[PDB]
Amino acid sequence: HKSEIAHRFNDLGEKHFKGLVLVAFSQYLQQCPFEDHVKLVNEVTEFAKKCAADESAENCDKSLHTLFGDKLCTVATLRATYGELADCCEKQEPERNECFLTHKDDHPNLPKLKPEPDAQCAAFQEDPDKFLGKYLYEVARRHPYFYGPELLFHAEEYKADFTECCPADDKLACLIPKLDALKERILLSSAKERLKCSSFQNFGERAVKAWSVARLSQKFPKADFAEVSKIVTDLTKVHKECCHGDLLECADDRADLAKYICEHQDSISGKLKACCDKPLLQKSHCIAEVKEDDLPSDLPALAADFAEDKEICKHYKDAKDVFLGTFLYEYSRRHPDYSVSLLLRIAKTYEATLEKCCAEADPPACYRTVFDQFTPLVEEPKSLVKKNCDLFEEVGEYDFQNALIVRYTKKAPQVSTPTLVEIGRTLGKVGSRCCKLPESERLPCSENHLALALNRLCVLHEKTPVSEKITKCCTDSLAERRPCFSALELDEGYVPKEFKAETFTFHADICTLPEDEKQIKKQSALAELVKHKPKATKEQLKTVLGNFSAFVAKCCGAEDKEACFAEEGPKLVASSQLALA
Ligand SMILES: [Zn+2]
Ligand SMILES: [Zn+2]
Ligand SMILES: [Zn+2]
Ligand SMILES: [Zn+2]
Ligand SMILES: [Zn+2]
Ligand SMILES: [Zn+2]
Ligand SMILES: [Zn+2]
Ligand SMILES: [Zn+2]
Ligand SMILES: [Zn+2]
Ligand SMILES: [Zn+2]
């Protein structure tokens, strides 16, 4: 064709086109006001309509990156507000776009979105388009790698939540539990896409492919290797584009893939029926979240092709990519009770066993026991999960989170306290989510979600690097990342942080906060306790923190709260140092 922007506008439709352009620009330029981004969207949209009418018109030929990039580079106060991005604007494509992506900010530290039911219902009623658009903008700048089409889907949930609750009597009671739930899905979804983009960035397209082979094989065990390979190839390109900033392209290709999967759902999975009986946005989303299908009764025995066959070395040499891909496909569809990363470690061990064995005198005898090399790899994460769920079920989320904050602060005491607490708390929510599930679903859930949390830590560490041990675990191997982190002990070369009384001094500020914000304050103190006394046991730390909790409960119950904190605080601060030796 002649004009890409015209083609995108026509296939996607104006609503979704404007939505995706608003998202795209909000992510690149995280600090600009909403009303001003709206004007850039409208200008770009006007251009697209003009081109759609005459594709031969001047500039309609230009690439989407060129058109979007030229637009962002016209923004008022560019050099003052976005000093780093103005530099990018001196460059031509595709350099300019690479430069833009370097400077996306994964921790922009904007205000937390606290919902104001009455004021929001008021702004929703007068102008839904403006209100719904504002939601896209606020989430996108807060999550600069968020999946464009996914955010449009979640914008529709947000709209439905307000459509249900704003006519009702009690607005705040209808709405808050729904918004709190939507927010949990925003956090999860955001972390999932970021891991995909992080994998492209730090490990390449092969790693993303392999991850997707394993996962889609688990979900769609009925599908044959050609079908899984096809979907993976397509899905990889979708996410590559969404991660490279090609949001229109990302959306068009996502829709095509959804159509393909739904045309071939008898061949792919019996669970897709519900998903495929829906409009576009909802269809793609249901497929991405779809439950794993039942194991086929005709799954083939694998020992003959992958352990007993005497020409495996020739198969490995003559067709490395396809023989290994077939193995991962076959083993993954067979194991929905394994984590994706476990499956990837198992494939890596398979490859290594063949490398070793095929260079020796008698290869068949050597690789005969290849499947028995997987056994210890399965045991380690199963033990880790049984152990952590036992602890969670005994002590509950708060104490489990604390235990993890201690565990991780010891691994990396150079990391900032807000980061350690964020990560420890996220790691702790894995228990709440995964330990309740059917027992065969715990390992996949647990490890898959730990991967998301560890990627967050790694992403933060790229920006703010403090620890060579974290660097190594985050960059050496995507499959080995969780076991790498687990194997880290107390960093012995860390110099204990100097004591500062104010760090451990509480005040009546704390009493008025909601529960989770009080917890974060206490959990920050705990982190700092570990930094001061890194060799102190988790049992010593739990006791000391308990004594701080008791102190806070008492003085928040006091008639004179300030005097209580002032009399009692310093004694507790002094005594705490002696309890952590
Ligand atoms: Zn055309
Ligand atoms: Zn095209
Ligand atoms: Zn198209
Ligand atoms: Zn659409
Ligand atoms: Zn958010
Ligand atoms: Zn979602
Ligand atoms: Zn691109
Ligand atoms: Zn053979
Ligand atoms: Zn299994
Ligand atoms: Zn305070």
From Swiss-Prot:
Annotated TM spans: none
SS bond partners: C51-C60, C73-C89, C88-C99, C121-C166, C165-C174, C197-C243, C242-C250, C262-C276, C275-C286, C313-C358, C357-C366, C389-C435, C434-C445, C458-C474, C473-C484, C511-C556, C555-C564
Tissues with expression: Plasma.
Residues the entry annotates as binding Zn(2+): H65, H244, D246
Gene3D superfamilies: 1.10.246.10
PROSITE patterns: ALBUMIN_1 (PS00212), ALBUMIN_2 (PS51438)
Keywords: Allergen, Calcium, Cleavage on pair of basic residues, Copper, Disulfide bond, Lipid-binding, Metal-binding, Methylation, Phosphoprotein, Repeat, Secreted, Signal, Zinc
Matches recorded under SMART domains: ALBUMIN
GO terms of biological process kind: cellular response to calcium ion starvation; cellular response to starvation; negative regulation of mitochondrial depolarization
Modified sites of kind Phosphoserine: S3, S56, S63, S416, S486
Subcellular localization: Secreted
Binding-site list for Ca(2+) 1: E4, E241, D246, E249
Tagged with keyword Disulfide bond: yes
CDD domains: ALBUMIN
Gene Ontology cellular component terms for the protein in this record: cytoplasm; extracellular space; protein-containing complex
Modified residues (Phosphothreonine): T81, T417, T419, T543
Family designation: Belongs to the ALB/AFP/VDB family.
Function description: Binds water, Ca(2+), Na(+), K(+), fatty acids, hormones, bilirubin and drugs. Its main function is the regulation of the colloidal osmotic pressure of blood. Major zinc transporter in plasma, typically binds about 80% of all plasma zinc. Major calcium and magnesium transporter in plasma, binds approximately 45% of circulating calcium and magnesium in plasma. Potentially has more than two calcium-binding sites and might additionally bind calcium in a non-specific manner.
The protein's name: Albumin
Lineage: Eukaryota, Metazoa, Chordata, Craniata, Vertebrata
